[PDB]
Symmetry: C3
């Protein structure tokens, strides 16, 4: 009939260039060649389908719709339904096997994509259609929904061979309790994971080999059965330089993070553990940074450390430099106020409003600064030079008052091998002064061996005459020193109670050393009774200084 | 016919399957059924429009253009013009009400989208078409432009019920000065806000309820009239675990951030306040981390604190661990060098090149470490054990010289209940030594009650005989101690100037304690005149040590 | 003609509205006007091409495909091939010159885009099609590939006038060794750079003018010939407020980052230098934050500092608050344990497991806290008040034992201008006690001038009578003090060995001061021989305290 348009191929006809007819299925074809006698139903040489996007043009750019359709390709291009029912695993696989697709796999605008079989990403990363809250509202708008009841997924990871990107993604496992379905495997060398929400699964993120240049941020990781993030490191490569920031772990049956082996130089900050059964676990944690942690409640456990390091002396070199909030059963081995152990401390510096402290793994030494002052873990505080080769004494300066202008006066002490003093100053008369801790030394004829202080001993020279003298090898001297002789015990060690009167005489180092330069090797003590006869105490003390 | 193609529906004709005719509007329809006698102008059963994307195919994928058009949906799909003039609010609303759209609302590639009415996002997040600089160049390429002169927006927020995402967005309010138009309301529980530029508005980001798992980064927030970020928390839920990083606040008439109530465990880092009239304000700030801030100039105010906490003793537990640059009127209550108050300190640890300090809110105690040493806020420095149950003394070790090999020699002190000494060593003779601070105790017959030092007092036993003895309950002993008797004041308290000679006798703890083991309870002092008769001074001093 | 559809324009025909004919090229046109007699081959007024996307509709939205094609525009829209061979520079330029394109330039889904000529971005930012690993696998899926052998690119930057965004991008330079081809120029004021991988180039990122509000994160920067990031700052604006996080610099022939001039208030964290020939270099680094750095191996250099600051005293105010790992030749001038210099220190606070320290650029002073205690860089440790106007003494409290309940007993010391003591307590008898460091002062008639301690000196008054007296301006007093007179040197400075007996008498400040209130100005010492005659020693010591 001439009242509608419809012509099928006729073998008797010669079709000119640009002639249009219908294929037997009704689709229109256009001849691209002169003298066309080929049947387009069996042989499309010399014909094009007019309803193809390669034959549709955007006049704004003078290009085909075919070209425009290369701007963004998703799993929907390969037949994914995203309908919450149909298995889309074959469409996901076809995307990853395609020659047309780029670095990443993309989801379409709206969809709940069911997966019932493992997808091999073939090195492609994963970009979703939104990072949603943990609710059906968001799952229905955009997510990957792994069917954990699928026999082909039991004990397996849903996505393998992930590229260096996981982002902008909501992913859940439905009906997988007890089936050990993990979400994704990604290599530890070079990754950017950000803005993800993962729900259920056994291990949510499975890291292959070891971390290096691995960046993980802004993740809501809810209801994992074993771990949020799991790194086996089967070859013991040793993980390094991983960052873990802004991660919310909630209501996991296991740990937040499990490293079977060793972690060096990694950074963890702004992490939340809410009703988990474990925090971060590793064999070794070395030279890592830890910032703020908020640890609130345990799922079924009664007590757990926020950081658990299993190796002996294998937690060391760390920076615990943010406040760790502990509520509802969480504990810490990293608090500045924690007492040190002789070994197996969690080694590092700890800085928060609780205190500023520093400790090593394999020793009791620990220093803590608080608003009130200092605390030590080994009953000892050292003061020395930063340089190990410097061998001068130190000087301590301490505020003791005001000068004449009203400014703080800091007085200087002395602590050398030969002198212990504390300085002062009289600003009324403008004179320096000092308080002294003298050397004290006692003679006692009942001693088995003479008492020695700092290379000096007291010996009897003759009746009533005692030398406070230098022993062999003592080349130190007294310079203009102060001398006080103590009280004699006469007749016996207990004493009779009788008294005696003393005088002194200096012992020079060389002729005139004392007379001219007030240098002495020591001094003699002479003891006399009330008749002025020389007499021998059983015991007496002397006190002296080696400087003025 | 005959020289062009055009056939309208004719009720006398039976249209076979695949027949094509034109609707009365000129659009071509194709029959999908045999024996078609239905008028496609009134009833499209058995017909399809050939210019629909459901009838156009991409042969590369063997799918319709309709499917490909599900890859990315924007407000442009719902009639938004983005032309800088036409109100697009209805198109934005239709997007949010549509069954076809995903987690987020998207803008088209290019457009300045005018909004004159409030949009209810219905839980969808917001993704823009670029995070631009603050200039018309970027607004013209891609932004949301809220008409602040619109009566329907006065006193209201432009977008309500935002989902968990705001990203890649430029948004401004035009002609809204004095109209109190705010930009967006987002729930505090689970948010990722990043790469945004917001210009004008009253409150730019309005947080509903309280922060928890709320992450905010990389934002240029210019010219707000009240606040960049405002959290009312009307139910006093208490905000936690919010992160605020890489935010540039510039030329706001009010504050950068206002929390009407309480914030716990939040992190703030790499924040700039340039010509604002306020920094961060809250009622309570507890266990929060603060990193680097650059605060330069105030808009109209003369002086403002970078952090303003209004509650009494409600700033505590914090980490102020980055440098805060203060220029042009900004002040700080968190500097390490700030003197402590007896109460209402901004409590926390403060660490920067200005000093390392720690302070609590409700107490004067504060410790500060600087290159020169230490400073205290309460005129006191404590030194004790980390363990509160340990009750041993401490030992301090201090460099005083070199050993014979040239290495540093650290000498040990003694400070027990019974002994105060400073150790030394003579490496020439290989002898230890010590400097002493003895107990001193004075007898004075004019005292109302005897002087007591450490459980010892001096009493007259008989003429010229005095006991330096233990009082009731003092079970401590002298072991091989040093004894020095001081100078007598004879005849009166002032003294006559006459002298006397002393001797001592030990007082044993048990028979033979001193003679055999040099243990004593105390000692007697005997005083005699020049004729060797026992005499009584009015006043005299003794000095002794309880150890050698 | 009757068995197919084909009709060309015929000037004898009047075409009704909706009539369809073919253009001479075979494309169908439809008349949009009644009585159409215009030839569509020369004049398209009154006609539309039916295969244009402006004539194709998505019935789901009731809009044209033309509108949908505004959702995402890429370089593919302007003829870019992304085929690894064809120069796409003209297509990139057309995109940037187009009225249709938004804030940023976008790549299509898949392609290796060759550029042989410089592209002027015209203020558009750059968004790629993935941030890949450093391998051909990823370059083939999606990258920009700059032809470094192109003569038009020698010595030039490939992209100029970049907008505020660079993201989600992989870019390499092929065959550019020795040709000094740099990648991109971007203004320092307001930038967000994230998730990029850059390979080869001379300078990878060229920052124009100076940093301010410049945010750079998550970047793998491999094989640069001069620098990963270069900032000349030709006008000396001074760079501020830049953030550099999560950057992996690997196998560069030059530095990671070069600032020719000054940097203030910038933040660097989680940075890796692997086999580079330099770290960060700048003229001045002021008030910057440095976090974790992992520096492992040098490419050809033997030794390099991770941070190199060239100006004298131009590294100051900084926070070195993360661990810096140094392996294979990297060195540091920022370690807490490094000895201080008199000048040119890298000034700042340094906090890690190595120690907690603080130092200024232009002074030797440095304090270090370690597990064992403290170390100083200038042989001095100060203890004072935080307030510069407070002029009271300090009290130190130190654990010395236990009280009767078994709690720690902290004893208090005394260090004033007039007194030095250490407190103790006897919990058996419940008595306070103290250890004393007295003032010591010696008389010697051979001194050129009298010895003075704290405003007191000893003068001869008459035969055998000596005054321990206040000098002019000393208004301080003795209150209930302890007095010990030392041993006399008789006859000469050396001493004869004869002795003498002393007594004392107080010198009052006013009549009755000592007798009634135990206040004294000083005291007299009287010396007598065995016949009780007054005698003059040549030299003697006194020790006394100004308080009890």
């Amino acid at each position: 009939q001439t009242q509608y348009y419809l012509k099928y191929f006729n073998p008797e006809i010669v079709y000119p260039k640009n002639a249009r007819i219908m294929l037997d299925n009704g689709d229109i074809v256009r001849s691209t060649v002169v003298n066309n006698t080929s049947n387009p139903n069996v042989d499309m040489t010399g014909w094009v389908k007019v309803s193809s996007v390669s034959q549709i043009f955007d006049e704004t750019y003078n290009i085909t719709q075919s070209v425009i359709n290369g701007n963004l390709i998703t799993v929907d291009n390969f037949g994914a339904k995203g309908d919450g029912v149909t298995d889309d695993s074959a469409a996901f696989q076809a995307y990853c096997d395609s020659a047309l697709t780029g670095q990443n796999l993309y989801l379409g605008a709206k969809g709940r994509y069911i997966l019932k079989n493992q997808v091999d990403l073939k090195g492609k990363g994963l970009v979703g259609n939104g990072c949603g809250k943990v609710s059906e509202f968001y799952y229905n708008l955009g997510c990957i929904d792994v069917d954990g009841s699928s026999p082909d997924l039991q004990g397996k990871t849903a996505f393998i061979n992930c590229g260096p990107t996981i982002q902008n993604l909501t992913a859940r496992c439905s009906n997988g309790a007890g089936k050990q379905v993990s979400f994704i495997e990604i290599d530890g060398y070079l990754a950017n994971i950000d803005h993800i929400t993962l729900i259920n699964f056994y291990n949510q993120i499975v890291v292959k080999q070891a971390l290096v240049g691995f960046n993980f941020t802004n993740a809501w990781l809810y209801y994992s059965q074993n771990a949020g993030i799991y790194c086996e490191d089967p070859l013991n490569r040793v993980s390094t330089t991983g960052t873990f920031h802004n991660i919310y772990f909630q209501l996991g049956d296991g740990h937040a993070m499990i490293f079977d082996r060793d972690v060096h130089g990694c950074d963890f900050d702004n992490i939340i553990f809410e009703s988990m059964n474990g925090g971060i676990k590793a064999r070794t944690v070395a030279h890592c940074g830890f910032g703020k942690f908020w640890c609130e409640n345990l799922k079924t456990a009664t007590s757990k450390d926020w950081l658990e390091v299993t190796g002996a002396n294998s937690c060391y070199g760390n920076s615990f430099t943010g406040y760790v909030k502990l509520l509802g059963g969480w504990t810490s081995k990293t608090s500045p106020t924690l007492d040190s152990l002789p070994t197996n401390n969690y080694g590092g510096v700890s800085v928060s409003a609780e205190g500023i402290s520093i400790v090593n793994a394999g020793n009791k030494a620990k220093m803590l600064m608080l608003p009130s002052g200092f605390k030590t873990g080994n009953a000892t505080i050292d003061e020395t030079h930063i340089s190990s080769s410097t061998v001068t004494p130190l000087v301590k300066r301490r505020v003791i008052g005001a000068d004449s202008s009203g400014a703080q006066y800091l007085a200087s002490d002395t602590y050398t091998k030969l002198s212990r003093k504390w300085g002062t100053y009289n600003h009324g008369s403008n004179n320096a002064g000092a308080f002294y801790a003298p050397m004290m030394l006692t003679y006692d004829q009942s001693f088995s061996t003479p008492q020695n202080n700092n290379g000096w001993k007291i010996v009897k020279e003759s009746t009533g005459v005692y030398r406070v003298e230098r022993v062999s090898g003592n080349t130190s001297v007294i310079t203009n020193g102060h001398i006080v002789v103590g009280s004699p015990l006469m007749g016996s060690r207990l004493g009779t109670g009788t008294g005696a009167t003393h005088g002194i005489q200096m012992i020079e180092t060389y002729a005139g050393s004392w007379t001219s330069y007030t240098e002495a090797a020591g001094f003699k003590v002479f003891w006399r009774d009330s008749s002025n006869a020389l007499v021998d105490p059983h015991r007496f003390t002397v006190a002296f200084t080696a400087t003025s």
